[PDB]
Write a protein that binds this ligand. Sequence first.
Ligand SMILES: CCC(CC)c1cc(N[C@H]2CC[C@H](N)C2)n2nccc2n1
Lengths: 252, 306
Amino acid sequence: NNKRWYFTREQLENSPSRAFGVDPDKELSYRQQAANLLQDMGQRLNVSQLTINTAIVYMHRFYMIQSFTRFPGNSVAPAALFLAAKVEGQPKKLEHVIRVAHTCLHPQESLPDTRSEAYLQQVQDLVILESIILQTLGFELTIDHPHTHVVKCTQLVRASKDLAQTSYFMATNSLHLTTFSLQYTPPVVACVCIHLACKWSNWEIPVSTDGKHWWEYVDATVTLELLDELTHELLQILEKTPNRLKRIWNWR
Amino acid sequence: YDDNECPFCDEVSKYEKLAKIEVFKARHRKTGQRVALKKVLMENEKEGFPITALREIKILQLLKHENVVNLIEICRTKASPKGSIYLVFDFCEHDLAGLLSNVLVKFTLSEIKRVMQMLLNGLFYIHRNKILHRDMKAANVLITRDGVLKLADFGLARAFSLSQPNRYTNRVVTLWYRPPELLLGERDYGPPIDLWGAGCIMAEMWTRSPIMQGNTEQHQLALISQLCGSITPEVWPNVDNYELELVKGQKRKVKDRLAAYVRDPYALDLIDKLLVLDPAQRIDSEDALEHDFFWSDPMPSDLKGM
Ligand SMILES: CCC(CC)c1cc(N[C@H]2CC[C@H](N)C2)n2nccc2n1
């Protein structure tokens, strides 16, 4: 199917995290936190943003089956990377991912001995969860991301160096801050990211001379009722996310 | 510790092992469909779940087409008291190697033609998705009860995309079915390594025999150099941007050697268009599919070897 890893708002409401006594909003924070780790970890490993995004998608799908009370964000994330690395063809040594994971989570604590049973176990735990996330996803590891549809769409509507890379950033952040990955398809998500980037970069794109709006060429299941519904949701959560909108804010 | 929670992974024991082709035959204990199951993983694998696996797994999922074996699903074991992870394939009655080695099952030119059309279209599809096979041999051509040709052993199969000069895997394929480019250590090659192989497998329909059995790598190079002649910038433009070795003073004899076993004029040619030194002058799949061995009488017929 193409609607197995997709869900309604009430489907998200009744996630596994709920029934183990964790709030709706608290879960989002549990999620948002797994991204930041995936991101920071990913930067220390010199893996792509793609790899990092793909790692975030696995975890976003993962905690639709498992519960954060059952599996911690911190225990799953280094697995989701290690896998995503291998999936997206930037394989990282298992030693390597552990170094980073450690110094992120435990900054003061220097790493245990590589001989000690301590380490050799925090080795295994990772190998464990890799196997588990494969099973959870059913080895469905290929991820279409909203970026691919943007990068094409921006050129195909001659966007500037600004509006294009702003749109890219919105998508990168539509994985960290929201469950758009679980609700809407990549092409839909792409449009939301461009529709906001436009309103923010104060450049509403001209309609084609046929009469069809720009979004109709990206995905026909899209409407302005939906874009203006969603862009607002994403803008808000960005407003809340600190010195996030500053990264794209024009000081001139 | 455990998980006790998995929607899209199955437990393998739903399928019932019968015998080995770690590759078992099997049957589903409800629907009674025959499958083949393939184990993975080892103690050797000391760096997470095998990546080579994830390569194959990902490829099999991508490739869906008439003549490319299907991965049904990937089922898993229970907690260790068989073990590891299994790849489920629609069972394919016979492979090609077994039907050739088997003296009984003899084919018509009519039946022999179709076989190829399924194969080359098969190759067409996989190359179309930018995935090389890199292991073309008779045993890797499967065929069903209906008579549906499939391809196997996408373990070696790699995703490709030629950008700058790229660095592909060097020693691939069986040594018998290996082509020239690879025997000089070409590491920026493309599909027509397979299309070579297909030629070796095509001729093997009549010869009923691996047509080249070079033990040494220069023994291989020698057996091929009997066919194409000397390895010349004439025949293969800029052959002298890589590699002295031996047997660079031969003359050609592609068709004439195996002519007594083909008989068909149209086929002899098709073999010789696949079996060229230069990969740029080695017929692609489409060219073959549209060739007039496929559009000539007697035309391709459905399989019923029995
Ligand atoms: C080299 C044989 C490969 C091993 C990966 C194979 C063989 C069969 N079937 C066998 C049964 C008897 C004949 N040798 C073909 N199947 N069936 C599905 C998948 C598959 N793969």
